[PDB]
Amino acid sequence: MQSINFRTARGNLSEVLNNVEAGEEVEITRRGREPAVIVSKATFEAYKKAALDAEFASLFDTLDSTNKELVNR
Amino acid sequence: QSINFRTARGNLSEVLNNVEAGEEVEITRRGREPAVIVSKATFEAYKKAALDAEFASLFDTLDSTNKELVN
Amino acid sequence: QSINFRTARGNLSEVLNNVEAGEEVEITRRGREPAVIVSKATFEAYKKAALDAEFASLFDTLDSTNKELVN
Amino acid sequence: MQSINFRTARGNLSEVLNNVEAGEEVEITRRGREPAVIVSKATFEAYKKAALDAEFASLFDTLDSTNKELVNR
Amino acid sequence: MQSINFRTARGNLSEVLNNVEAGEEVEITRRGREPAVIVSKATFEAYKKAALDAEFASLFDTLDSTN
Amino acid sequence: MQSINFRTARGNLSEVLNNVEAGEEVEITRRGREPAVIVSKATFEAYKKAALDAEFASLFDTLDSTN
Amino acid sequence: MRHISPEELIALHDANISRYGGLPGMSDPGRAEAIIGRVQARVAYEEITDLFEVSATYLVATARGHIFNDANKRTALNSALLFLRRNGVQVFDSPELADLTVGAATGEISVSSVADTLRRLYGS
Amino acid sequence: MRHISPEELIALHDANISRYGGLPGMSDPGRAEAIIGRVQARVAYEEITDLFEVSATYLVATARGHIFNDANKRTALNSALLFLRRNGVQVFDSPELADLTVGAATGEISVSSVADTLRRLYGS
């Protein structure tokens, strides 16, 4: 994952958004700053959809009984 | 929080800060597929919760820190 | 509280009761000059506060319970 | 002031409203009921405008000083 | 809040919105339908916010307090 | 709350009111003017009542409590 | 107790507007019924029986409610004292009324505190 | 503490709607942000630090808020326990959860009382 400066990012953004849609995720760094990153909503939504689905899925496993009862309550 | 690339590149310091406060900032474009910008942590958080879920889908595990990727 | 005469004569028991609870009920009519219905007390209350004010306008007083009226 | 029953009133209302506008105020009575009365909004509004004007007018007299100060507060 | 029928609202709309911008609440009636209201967005947003604050508060009042 | 420009509201009004009756809040924008909102009267009245209850309550909160 | 109706408040205000001056009208259609109705419902709901607490409620709600485009302070003080007079309490002008009314209007003096002053000024 | 965002509540609800059934969607546009935003502001405003009082707030606001057309009770219980799990408290299904959740939803069990049960069920 290419790691670009603040300037490069801010100066060549549309180009960045061009690479990203091609599938490439790009980290942008700031001095004295925690990093950020950027890729298609699709590849961001895919990861976070993946994570939350699993976090909920197991929540539901654990409370499967009550979840099914509450349908009829 | 959705905004276009002009708005985005125009106030980028504020965008990155908003993101450094847990904000997910979609970056829209005229007739294009949108992008996203979030914290470094949060990103790998989803990634390192997503991978865990599809490694658990094969029912095996690891190490699948290899397909990172190198066939 | 304004209402027309049909509405008025139609639910008159309720009108008079509303009036017996301090309600002033205007009675409108198609292209006519409207009327009013209120308690007996309240009516003379205004009347016996109004007369007091125009008897005090001449600066004399009474008895002007004569113009009630009999020139 | 003519004093009419509940029936007469309810049965001959438009006629009542005809007499009233001619200036005549009409009391309507109910059995086991406090009486009511009715005349033109004009002659009802004239009396109540008369009464309240005087009730306020003297209120204002009593608080004339503060009323004038409060304009500039 | 003045009330206006449908045809009068389609027939004088620019000026409905003017009055509305000037702070008026205008009801629009339709024969055989439920009436609507046109009001400035700013006023609406502020009313809705207060309605939601109220709804939210009501959630924390048990059946005992209500009443 | 979908947003609709002026011309689209004058051009599709019967169905704006239908949607509105069906529970929708529709913003109407005018180039160079403040936006309006059309909403059912019932919903508006309930929002306004809550806004007034709130305004009234605020009257009894001194400058000390606010804050 | 006798109360002041929204309609009487409008009239009390209109007479004051014409006798002392100011911009005319209500700030919003039906706002007097909205505020004064709520004043009386507050009294009924909280069961307020002390005439001075009730009077102060009228004073504060009107001083801060901005029912009218103008003469809100004057209408507040007058409605509050008209309330007491109508309920058997004798009232008279005082050097404190202006500051008291301005403090009610700004939110610096609370209802109960407004009521205390009134209880001293006109109480038994 | 970690919180549940309005967007996560929507997603928690959508997954539950598809896994257990029910009518889909929100009862009104943006109602999840309206309720959950207010839940978090209540926590910040009242400075609620006890994890069980905070969890119960999620449970009650959602059980009674009617954010969704369906699965409001299920989303309430799940969001409340997901909250605790996310904050280091281990959770497990219990025979009391249904009644507790129904009581929260009807307004018969208050937040603090919901919190007590949770403090017993999962507290240390």
B59: left (phi over 0), alpha (psi -120 to 50) or beta: left
Which residue has 């959860």 as its token pair? H97
Q: Using an 8 Å CB-CB cutoff, list chain G residues near D64.
A: 93
Instruction: Please tell me what resolution, in angstroms, this structure has.
Output: 2.4
Q: Give the H or E element holding residue H53.
A: helix H51-65
Method of determination is: X-ray
Which residue has 């408290």 as its token pair? H89
Q: Report the residue of E1, E5, E18, E44 to disrupt the F interface, i.e. the one with the largest count of F CBs within 10 Å.
A: E44
**D40 in Cβ contact with C33 (< 8 Å):** yes
Distance (Å, rounded) from C-alpha H53 to C-alpha H117?
10
Query: Which 3 state secondary structure label does DSSP give G2?
Result: coil
Distance (Å, rounded) from C-alpha H76 to C-alpha H74?
5
E18: left (phi over 0), alpha (psi -120 to 50) or beta: alpha
User: Read out DSSP for G46-72?
Assistant: HT---HHHHHHHHHHHHHHH--BSS-H
**H22 in Cβ contact with A60 (< 8 Å):** no
Q: Using an 8 Å CB-CB cutoff, list chain A residues near B29.
A: 14, 17
Distance (Å, rounded) from C-alpha G121 to C-alpha H6?
55
Q: Which residues contact C39 (CB under 8 A, 6 or more apart)?
A: C19, C20, C22, D34, D35, D36
Q: Using an 8 Å CB-CB cutoff, list chain D residues near G20.
A: 60, 67-68, 71
The length of chain D, given as a count of residues: 73
Distance (Å, rounded) from C-alpha E37 to C-alpha E13?
13
Query: Which 3 state secondary structure label does DSSP give B71?
Result: coil
CB–CB contact D47 C52 (8 Å): no
Helix axes H97-106, H111-122, angle to 10 degrees: 170
G75: left (phi over 0), alpha (psi -120 to 50) or beta: alpha
Q: Give the H or E element holding residue E36.
A: strand E36-40
CB–CB contact G93 D66 (8 Å): yes
Q: Report the residue of D18, D27, D33, D48 to disrupt the C interface, i.e. the one with the largest count of C CBs within 10 Å.
A: D48
Q: Using an 8 Å CB-CB cutoff, list chain H residues near F1.
A: 29-30
Query: Which 3 state secondary structure label does DSSP give H95?
Result: coil
Give buried/exposed letters for D19-28 (b at 16+ CB in 10 A, else e): bbbeeebbbb
Which residue has 């509280």 as its token pair? C1
Rounded to a whole number, what is the distance in Å from the CA of D42 to chain G's nearest CA?
16
Rounded to a whole number, what is the distance in Å from the CA of D8 to chain C's nearest CA?
11
The CATH code for residues G1-124 is 1.20.120.1870
* Residue among A29, E47, E22 nearest F51 (CA): E47
Distance (Å, rounded) from C-alpha C13 to C-alpha C2?
16
* Gyration radius of chain B's alpha carbons: 16
**G35 in Cβ contact with F56 (< 8 Å):** yes
CB–CB contact C35 D30 (8 Å): no
Q: Using an 8 Å CB-CB cutoff, list chain E residues near G29.
A: 1, 25
- Whether residue D18 is preceded by a cis peptide bond, meaning omega within 30 degrees of 0, is no
The full set of domains in chain E, from first to last, is 1-49 (3.40.1620.10)
Give buried/exposed letters for A28-66 (b at 16+ CB in 10 A, else e): bbbeeeeebbbbbbebbeebbebbbebbbeebbebbeeb
Q: Using an 8 Å CB-CB cutoff, list chain F residues near E10.
A: 10, 13
Strand partners, C25: C37
With the CA atoms of B39, B42, B46 and B47 taken in that order, what torsion angle do they form, in degrees rounded to the nearest 10?
60
Q: Which residues contact C20 (CB under 8 A, 6 or more apart)?
A: C39, D33, D34, D36
Strands D36-40, E2-5: pairing is: unpaired
Minimum CA–CA partner of B68 in chain A: A1
Tokens of G91: 């009232």
C62: left (phi over 0), alpha (psi -120 to 50) or beta: beta
Minimum CA–CA partner of E35 in chain F: F41
Task: Please state, in angstroms and as integers, the Cα–Cα distance from residue B35 to each residue in B1, B46, B51, following that order.
Answer: 12, 16, 21
**Which of G34, G108, G111 is opposite residue F60, by nearest beta carbon?**
G111
Query: Which 3 state secondary structure label does DSSP give F57?
Result: helix
Task: Please state, in angstroms and as integers, the Cα–Cα distance from residue F8 to each residue in A62, C49, G43, following that order.
Answer: 51, 59, 49
**Which of H60, H61, H107 is opposite residue E63, by nearest beta carbon?**
H107
